[PDB]
Amino acid sequence: RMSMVVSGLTPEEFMLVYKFARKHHITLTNLITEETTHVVMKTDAEFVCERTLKYFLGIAGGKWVVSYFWVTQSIKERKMLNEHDFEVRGDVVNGRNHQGPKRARESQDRKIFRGLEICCYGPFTNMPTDQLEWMVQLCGASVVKELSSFTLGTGVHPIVVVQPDAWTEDNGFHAIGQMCEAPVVTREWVLDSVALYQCQELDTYLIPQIP
């Protein structure tokens, strides 16, 4: 059942992690599947890190999100220690307190996009849709191909996520509530909601749409 990836880290910093994996009869892949059970992260002083794609996807997969100092210290102690000891609980934008991956690995079938419907209306950067979509897919939404393809009315709240600035020949992003009836929010909504594991009330990043 045991496997994982790395993020942030240098080559040398990769190496202790090979030695560490190679030790504990483990498996190690570059990029991330649903089988991956750990994401090992670069930090500093104590347990606060950075936003890396792999970083959300270990919360969105509500998997084990151990900080690097799990390894320089499972080596500097001849055995593998505990993961609740050395877990991430922050980043450069999202806190020092929060412990995102907690309510994540803990709060499972009650999942934060509880019957939502999400459309990642393009285009975005540093993040292929597939993987942003797959992120919300993992948080419990259900991705819509195009807007017009929504399933409106009964039950489900709808939302449109777009990356602000990454719009090429733009303001083509200001005519959207003018191309349907669902809250338009920045990639920001989505990221901040996964990481914190607080399904943000969206009242705050909601690009203004033309009546």
């Binding site: 993020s7 942030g8 240098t10 670069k42 500093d44 950075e50 936003r51 890396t52 794609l53 792999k54 970083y55 950067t125 540093n126």
Partner: peptide, 11 residues
């Protein structure tokens, strides 16, 4: 375009 995810030296 800062950007984010995976780098090095004077962090």
């Amino acid at each position: 375009g800062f950007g984010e995810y995976s780098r090095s030296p004077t962090f």
